[PDB]
């Protein structure tokens, strides 16, 4: 007792109500929250998401290579016509998410 655990409770950078097409490459994204984000026709090349939250997002017509989601959370999110196999999701959680047309 008396000696407590030192854990940062840091709020996530929040981005919302956007559409993204750019085939973004070679990136790392940590502590991010994407709300009502649309990823349409996106080539993820060598990108990773760490401790990020996706809420009410759509991935549609997406491809990914050397791309991973580590300890992320997905909520009310649709993956339509994507190439996302489980192994791309490390220690992640889905709540009320939909997958369609997975190649």
């Amino acid at each position: 007792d008396e000696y407590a655990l030192l854990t940062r409770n840091v709020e996530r950078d929040k981005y919302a109500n956007f559409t993204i097409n750019f085939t973004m490459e070679n990136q790392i994204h940590t502590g991010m929250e994407y709300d009502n984000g649309r990823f349409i026709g996106v080539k993820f090349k060598s990108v990773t998401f760490k401790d990020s939250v996706f809420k009410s997002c759509t991935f549609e017509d997406v491809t990914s290579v050397n791309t991973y989601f580590k300890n992320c959370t997905f909520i009310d999110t649709v993956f339509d016509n994507t190439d996302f196999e489980p192994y791309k999701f490390i220690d992640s959680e889905f709540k009320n998410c939909s997958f369609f047309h997975n190649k």
Partner: protein, 414 residues
């Protein structure tokens, strides 16, 4: 056998009433809801004002060691969506007083019957259903529950006429149940939780297997077509289509016009909450709308004559064919509704396995709607072989359908 009933609750003229000879008093809370379309369907939500309290006459209050009794009701339980629904048994029908009596409770994927004598001994029988299934018979669909108790033998629980679980209860002393039955979500930690229930009954005997199936069948409302959830099939309501020969497929349209066709396509997608549920997506494919042609109340009944609209790119089209195609199978097309002209489009709905019978305008059978495989494309067809097979009581494949409307107890995105 709904005559043996010591308590039979039904809707009537803006009220719940007991039809039994004991006219129990029924106190209704402030946030109780009923289905404008099937008024006997009652919804209770997770608030203290969503209550139905039945006060039994003292003559029928249960206080015995030996007397047999049963109960039955229909229930629709929405899917469990979150980890908050785990290990949280909540009472929904309570007839316990001073820690003796009976109750019906729910938990994640469970229906539970509990008996408790006045020494606090307990017996439970449980119906368990999986949420890790592509297409469930039970999640968010009306099912018939019946529980029977023989004080010298076993407690038993049936789902849709079928015995699930049975447990000896002779170890149980006197049971002194409450004189109130409280219909209420009690102890449930999920605020969005609700249940729907209809035709609750109590009986002062052990129903046998035959009486149970007879209740199941008559309360089915066999002349009214039902959608996938068990609700009354309705005109002017969009429905995703499911073909029971292969429910891992949905209906799509390659093109509008008499050159196009509808067809079956798979696989279905998936809806998932990690460790809570993993099911097939039901809101996939082109929706069908039933349109009137034939008992004026918006409910679809056995042998009604309808048109079927099909929804493509959120525009409504007409299901139709020309019977003059060679072959018995007439491929179906989605037509612009003004341009349908003389093509066959009149459909006789039927509730018992083939569901849609297409006719020409002279009243003649084109055939039941199902599918035919042409070069590995399952095209929808009207085919009189189906009609001839049902006569022979022969095996049919593909003429059995379910209509799936959007529903808040299923919870899939839009």
């Amino acid at each position: 056998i709904v005559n043996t009933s010591i308590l039979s609750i039904v809707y009537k003229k803006d009220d719940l009433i007991d039809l039994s000879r004991y006219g129990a008093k029924i106190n209704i809370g402030d946030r109780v809801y009923y289905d404008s379309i099937d008024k006997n369907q009652i919804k209770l939500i997770n608030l203290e004002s969503s209550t139905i309290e039945v006060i039994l006459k003292n003559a029928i209050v249960y206080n015995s060691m030996y007397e047999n009794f049963s109960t039955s009701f229909w229930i629709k339980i929405p899917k469990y969506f979150s980890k908050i629904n785990l290990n949280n048994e909540y009472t929904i029908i309570n007839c316990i007083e001073n820690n003796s009596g009976w109750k019906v409770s729910l938990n994640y994927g469970e229906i539970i019957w509990t008996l408790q004598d006045n020494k606090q001994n307990i017996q439970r029988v449980v119906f368990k259903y999986s949420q890790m299934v592509n297409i469930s018979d039970y999640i968010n669909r009306w099912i018939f529950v019946t529980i029977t108790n023989n004080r010298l033998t076993k407690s038993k629980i049936y789902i849709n006429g079928r015995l699930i679980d049975q447990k000896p209860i002779s170890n149980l002393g006197n049971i002194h149940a409450s004189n109130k039955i409280m219909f209420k979500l009690d102890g449930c930690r999920d605020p969005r939780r609700y249940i729907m229930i209809k035709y609750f009954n109590l009986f002062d005997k052990e129903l046998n297997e035959k009486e149970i199936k007879d209740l199941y069948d008559s309360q089915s409302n066999s002349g009214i077509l039902k959608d996938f959830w068990g609700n009354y099939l309705q005109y002017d309501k969009p429905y995703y289509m499911l073909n029971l020969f292969d429910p891992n497929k949905y209906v799509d349209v390659n093109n509008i016009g008499i050159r196009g066709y509808m067809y079956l396509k798979g696989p279905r997608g998936s809806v998932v909450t990690t460790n809570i549920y993993l099911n097939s997506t039901l809101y996939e494919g082109t929706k069908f709308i039933i349109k009137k042609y034939a008992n004026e109340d918006n409910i679809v009944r056995n042998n009604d004559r309808v048109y079927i609209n099909v929804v493509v790119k959120n525009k409504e089209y007409r299901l139709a064919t020309n019977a003059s195609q060679a072959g018995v199978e007439k491929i179906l097309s989605a037509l612009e509704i003004p341009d349908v002209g003389n093509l066959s489009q009149v459909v006789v709905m039927k509730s018992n396995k083939c569901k849609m019978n297409l006719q020409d305008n002279n009243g003649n059978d084109i055939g039941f709607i199902g599918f035919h495989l042409y070069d590995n494309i399952a095209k929808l067809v009207a085919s009189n072989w189906y009609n001839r097979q049902v006569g022979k009581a022969s095996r049919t494949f593909g003429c059995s359908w379910e209509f799936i409307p959007v529903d808040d107890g299923w919870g899939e995105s839009s």
